Nucleic acid binder design. Structure first.
Lengths: 333, 335, 107, 336, 336, 108
DNA sequence: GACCCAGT
DNA sequence: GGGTTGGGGGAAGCACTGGGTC
């Protein structure tokens, strides 16, 4: 039993850094591991040595550099380079740190530098803090390279994100699952499957990505991952990085729960599968304003939401399959 | 002087606390969550709530409106008339009044006298410190869980589309290159029964918090560093600023929504000295709890006058039957 | 469940294969809350039987089947003791939900 | 000069405020959930309603029509005369005057000195950055609580199908692919004891937000940009824009719906000063509220002018028994 | 020049404005829900009514019929000559002149110059986006509130069942097995003391809405794209279109319809300036509302002419006693 | 309870085919009524066409229609006097008219 | 406190 | 009852104060 200590800085940043510990220990084995939740600490309990932890990190960063150099001061189009990154100054600074550990971890040397965390990994960051009177200069939140590198590895593989640019503006929505009572390797590895690599949709037909609460449904639709949430308990945390008119700021940040959405989709896509995706995609593409009434009815069990969306969507175009109607009444009864 | 108003409000179909419209087209209204106890458990609902920043901004708006009536309207900052509410800055030491007078930031004594807006809501000056606490405090406007107990569902969010017609040099319609402004967006309006609670601190108007008392004749008296006759006028300028609240001037989109506003029930306490707030207009047990809190303050030596509007509030309390906010103000302006 | 045998008739007035497009009855039955408009709305839907009978024959497919009266009384016997809106909406919304289906029987 | 009008209207047979789109059949009417009692708790009930946007647009339409007759009608936006409410949208850096001139976009007062549209309904200047608060505030149109309590919400919506007769020159209507754009669309119409609570703030006309006052000898004097006679004429036109509100020009689709109207109980308060808004007519027991809003407010030192119709009040205040809204606004334009 | 007509008429067993049976035989009539005062409380009742689409279509038919009389009837629409009310259905970019020429839909002024019907009735050109709101507003046709109070409705439907006779050379009715036509369908008709109200905005004919005035010398001067004689002829045709609006050419059912439909009382105002619309006949107390709206308006220095029938509107009103319906628009047209 | 189906079977013979009799006016008036008085008027108008339909079915080969029992008349009479409020009057006004359209085997 | 940046 | 049409196209957020570095 080693019980790797995890520093507590931010409830969201600590989620990313601690939840990203598993991607390295899997590369190094670490059989019989667990992750005890603490709300924000989220401590890993594993009976493994510290030496293989760096062997996990070197493989993870080799994968990161292979992804980065493949696409294209050099700026890629990956999650850690330009996908979820809203600030251009971190388009090249972030990879430079990632390759920097190649001169530090390969020959078994500890970290000595300390970098600046961007807003994408942790929204509470910024430039203008308040201590006693007025503001300051730069970013007072400075993160050591050890905890800095452990966040991007968990961010790229596990937590998904949706990007919808439409030319000058840009909307980035980031969702992540946080365990709250217990979790094991069965769930944390399964959550990795939800990641959407290169979620660059653009055009104009795919406008349904408006609003975060509507983009989460589209992200979840095409990922029929593990449905363990019917017996487990998990929470979804989401945040947006709006860049309307080249104005990088956060305008939407809400806390919801994913278990009821899991149950809704699990109970919906059971009688048939061919027509359910077609129906939901049609209502999302055509009934842009109507799918909000459908998504809102899920976290509160709203009866009128199950009808308003269908009413507003049928007028444009809807297949309206038979087996899916019986799926809604399975939740209703 | 020291007035605590609270109660329940029935307003519906109102656009308050929108998401802007910088690039988002569907302007969905803010959505909140509230817990409610039922069937030996707790359940939540996605119901909107309005922040009290709207209430504070409208108090600021009404303060200058009722301050321009009296001939004492000279002592007011220029930024207050344009609804700025910046209150100087990290390096701004001079003030911009209606006549252009300059004010030096050295202490609250020379600030609350020459300026009136900076005293009700406070100010700050990081260059020289001297922060002023807001004398008026607002509360978040959220729907009561009694309405949830009797509803626990329904849409209660009216989504309506609005169109902005546009014309060309002769009446043509463009798509993406003709230079048109045709737009088709959505607006969500909120309904339900909410609650309100406002506290006023008129005892610190013209009296600095650092030296609230004179204390030079072995007799503690209020340290009114301003002229009493205009201090009394300033009392009403802030007391009547809550009148527009009880009429409909709440939130934004007033030109296009103007919430259907009518208070069903309220309770207030007025006193010469500091007094506790009764209850937020949220919990079901908001009457009897007040029935307790009054007897929790009378035994301590507080000359509290209770004003009730559409509530019996028992019979032992010497409450006054109030039928509107205006006669409450008229009964408070005397003292 | 006396629902699968009545929802397909409600679906006859929304499907594209029968172009009459009367959503007023669906809106009336969906927003039925207290005691009466739920029984009044379903009357409008069940009245437009000729419409469908003629429209199916106008294209070639067999005439649609009218729901049997063996289970209609299940709504009257249930709406009586379920007077409160707590559980009455619970089935009133499903009645309108089952109206938005395809039921492809007219190729 | 702030005036508050609030009252009832038996507005019925109207397809106003309709949610429909080109590619959307069955153009249906707006429905707003409301809170009522129905001898029980504060329950929620569905009911058709009307948006205040519409009322604002039709107030603009009436204001420009009544401002045409004014001798200073040349000082107005050309697009305003085109029955268009697009006040400084996106795509242009300036507007066009009625005579064909333009408007310059740095100072707020110079925008409204030769234009009477942004001085009566506000404006927005995207590229420049400046903005102006609105003058007239319109409320939603909701029926009385007791009306929907007595009928407990029996549909209250009438859907009528309408079609055209687009027959070809030969005299036959065959296939869609034939070229006959002829079809069946449905319109929803509503009824009820609706209510409105419009408010106007004529004390801010010609007063720029940046520099509302001058204080050249340190005296109370708001900074007016237009001539006082021009300001009086603009205020009179704004007040005269209220007659079409009850005259049937509530909303669009008058060519096919033109809702029926009748002058119900109305209350108007105006005393040329800061005045609170009135109580909306959506609540059945609001009349007694009007017996307490202005009962003691008159004793506060305000020369409140009250004009009432179809209500006896508490027979204790100086409430003028005005006949109709045109006399009401005639009594208002004579005191400015 | 603006005109407002309203009043009370009586209809007896008319099948005007029916949904259009379909296979169904009972040809259900349009039912509209309206408010009823009632000594107990404000209730709602459904009654058969007539939509405005009809009134507008029949007004357009009368307008084109009386415009054919004028020598300048060449500048018309081929669809208008065919009694078609549709305006540029999607599928064609340009249009066809009634003379047989082709009308380019690129300028609103040219369209209104070459199309007299679309100038007053508006149009819709989604292909090029040309829009113009109609100068005529038509309301519904509803029974008055006092009528419903004194009759309580009593389901107010007269159903008469008809058949179709298909006699061939063999003289066989058949059994719907050989290709015959023997079926039984029902048509219903409605009666009641209804009301009418139509608004005419005859001040924009010949003037595009995009450019209403020229302001060549900073003076009010409307810009007319046509010669004044054509404008006067169009005004005369529009005024004469209202004469059949109370004669019987209202509704549909041109094979069984045309009930009595004679006016019992009518009220009208006419003035070149902006004037309010009179109360549509629906209520038992609209007479004094119209009296006030026509009396107080004259106090504002408005040159407005008021015509009335049946009700003299007291002795203080100088309104003449107009008996028929053509003399009203005639006295209006001599005063231009 | 029990008589609703019996009266609905009778009302079914007025809207079904194989009878050359289609009178929707009365069935529309029975359901979407406003006052208790017109309910029994519509019931009478629907019930009046008993003898004209009791004989044509057997001539056309269909079994004769089953006339509703006179005992159900007592129930429908005694249900309406004590219930005068319009709140729960429309539900019974439309309950009997609902069974007019069904799958009754009128002409097997 | 003046610099920085993007791809259908 | 017996057939013709079920939207039609156009719009379905611009500008506006970007927040990080160094």
């Amino acid at each position: 039993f080693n019980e790797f200590k995890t520093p507590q800085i931010d409830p969201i940043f600590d989620l990313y850094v601690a939840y990203g510990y598993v991607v390295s220990l899997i590369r190094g084995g670490a059989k019989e591991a667990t992750l005890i939740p603490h709300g924000a600490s989220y401590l890993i309990q594993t009976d493994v040595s510290n030496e293989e932890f760096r062997h996990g990190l070197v493989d993870a960063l080799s994968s990161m550099l292979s992804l980065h150099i493949a696409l294209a001061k050099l700026v890629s189009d990956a999650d850690f380079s330009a996908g979820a990154n809203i600030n251009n100054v971190y388009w090249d600074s972030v990879p430079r740190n990632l390759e920097k550990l190649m001169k530090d971890l390969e020959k078994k040397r500890s970290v000595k530098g300390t970098a600046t965390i961007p807003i994408t990994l942790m929204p509470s960051a910024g430039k203008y803090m308040l201590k006693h009177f007025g503001v300051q200069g730069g970013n007072p939140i400075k993160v050591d390279l050890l905890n800095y590198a452990l966040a991007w590895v968990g961010f790229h593989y596990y937590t998904p994100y949706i990007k919808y640019a439409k030319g000058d503006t840009t909307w980035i929505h980031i969702y992540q699952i946080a365990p709250v009572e217990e979790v094991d390797m069965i769930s944390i590895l399964s959550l990795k499957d939800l990641k959407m690599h290169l979620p660059h949709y653009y055009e104009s037909n795919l406008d349904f990505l408006i609003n975060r609460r509507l983009a989460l449904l589209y992200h979840l639709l095409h990922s029929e991952a593990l449905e363990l949430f019917t017996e487990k308990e998990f929470v979804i945390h989401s945040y947006t990085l709006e860049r309307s008119g080249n104005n990088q700021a956060i305008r939407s940040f809400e806390e919801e729960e994913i278990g009821k959405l899991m149950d809704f989709l699990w109970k919906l896509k059971r009688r048939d599968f061919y027509h359910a995706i077609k129906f939901i995609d049609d209502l999302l593409k055509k009934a842009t304003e109507g799918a909000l009434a459908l998504i809102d009815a899920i976290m509160n069990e709203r009866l009128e939401g199950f009808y308003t969306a269908l009413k507003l969507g049928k007028k444009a175009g809807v297949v309206s399959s038979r087996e899916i109607v019986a799926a809604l009444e399975d939740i209703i009864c | 002087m020291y007035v605590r108003i609270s109660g329940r409000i029935r307003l519906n179909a109102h656009s308050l606390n929108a998401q802007g419209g910088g690039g988002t087209n569907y302007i969905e209204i803010t959505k909140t969550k509230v817990t409610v106890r039922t069937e030996n458990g707790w359940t939540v609902v996605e119901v909107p709530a309005i922040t009290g920043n709207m209430l504070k901004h409208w108090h600021f708006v009404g303060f200058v409106d009722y301050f321009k009536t009296t001939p004492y309207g000279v002592n007011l900052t220029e930024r207050a008339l344009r609804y700025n509410g910046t209150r100087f800055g990290q390096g701004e030491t001079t003030a911009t009044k209606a006549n252009g007078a300059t004010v030096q930031l050295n202490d609250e004594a020379t600030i609350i006298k020459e300026l009136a807006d900076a005293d009700v809501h406070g100010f700050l000056a990081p260059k020289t410190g001297r922060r002023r606490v807001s004398l008026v405090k607002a509360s978040f406007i959220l729907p009561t869980e009694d309405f949830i107990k009797e509803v626990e569902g329904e849409r209660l969010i009216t989504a309506i589309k609005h169109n902005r017609v546009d014309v060309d040099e002769k009446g043509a319609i463009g798509s993406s290159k003709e230079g048109t402004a045709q737009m088709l967006f959505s607006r969500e309006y909120a309904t339900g029964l909410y609650g309100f609670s406002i506290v006023l601190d008129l005892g610190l108007v013209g009296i600095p918090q650092g030296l609230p008392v004179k204390f030079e004749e072995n007799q503690p008296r209020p340290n009114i560093v301003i002229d009493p006759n205009e201090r009394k006028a300033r009392i009403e300028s802030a007391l009547k600023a809550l009148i527009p609240m009880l009429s409909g001037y709440i939130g934004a989109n007033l030109a296009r929504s103007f919430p259907v506003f009518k208070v069903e029930e309220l309770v207030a306490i007025a006193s010469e000295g500091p007094i506790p707030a009764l209850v937020h207009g949220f919990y079901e047990d908001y009457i009897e709890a007040n029935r307790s809190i009054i007897k929790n303050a009378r035994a301590l030596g507080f000359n509290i006058e209770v004003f009730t509007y559409n509530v019996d509030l028992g019979e032992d309390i010497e409450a006054t039957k109030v039928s509107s906010v205006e006669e409450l103000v008229a009964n408070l302006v005397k003292m | 469940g006396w629902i699968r045998n009545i929802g397909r008739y409600l679906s006859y007035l929304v499907d594209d294969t029968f172009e009459e497009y009367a959503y007023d009855v669906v809106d009336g039955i969906a927003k039925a809350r207290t005691q009466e408009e739920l029984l009044e709305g379903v009357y409008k839907a069940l009245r437009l039987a000729p419409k469908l009978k003629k429209k199916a024959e106008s294209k070639g497919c067999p005439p649609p089947r009218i729901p049997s009266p063996e289970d209609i009384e299940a709504l009257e016997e249930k709406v009586e003791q379920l007077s409160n809106p707590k559980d009455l909406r619970k089935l009133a919304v499903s009645l309108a939900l089952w109206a938005f289906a395809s039921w492809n029987n007219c190729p």
